[PDB]
Amino acid sequence: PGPVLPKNALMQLNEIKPGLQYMLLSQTGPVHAPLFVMSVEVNGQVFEGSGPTKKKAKLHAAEKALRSFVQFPN
RNA sequence: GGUAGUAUAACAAUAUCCGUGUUGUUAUAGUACC
């Protein structure tokens, strides 16, 4: 691997989750290394992911919440 | 003076459950590095 394929994580979440909420935590830093932690809320379970910039944060959250809440989609 | 990052905004392409995302190009600004 190298160029990865996070598009998979995004779409996969969308599939399992036709409607949910994304919310941001942290997001502060020196000036050029901002830490963003975006957490996704599904069915009352909230999973948090930390990325530099907005990209990876929500992404990683999607991955987590996927493996997680698929055990309780209702 | 030059180099760089982050953020906001616009356009296009790509994928798409049309909701959204990824990618590419451009513009503006504090700061950081030399």
Q: How many helices (H) and strands (E) does chain A have?
A: 2, 3
User: Which CATH number do you get for residue A24?
Assistant: 3.30.160.20
**Is there contact between A36 and strand B, defined as CB under 7 Å from any strand atom?**
yes
For the CA of A44 and the C1' of B21, the distance in angstroms is 23
**Is there contact between A54 and strand B, defined as CB under 7 Å from any strand atom?**
yes
Residue with the two structure tokens 């989609």: A73
The two structure tokens encoding residue A56:
């990876």
CA neighbor of A73 nearest in space, from A42, A47, A49, A46: A42
User: The domain containing residue A58 runs over which residues?
Assistant: 1-74
Q: How many domains does chain A have?
A: 1
Q: How far is CA A6 from the centre of its chain?
A: 11
**Is there contact between A51 and strand B, defined as CB under 7 Å from any strand atom?**
no
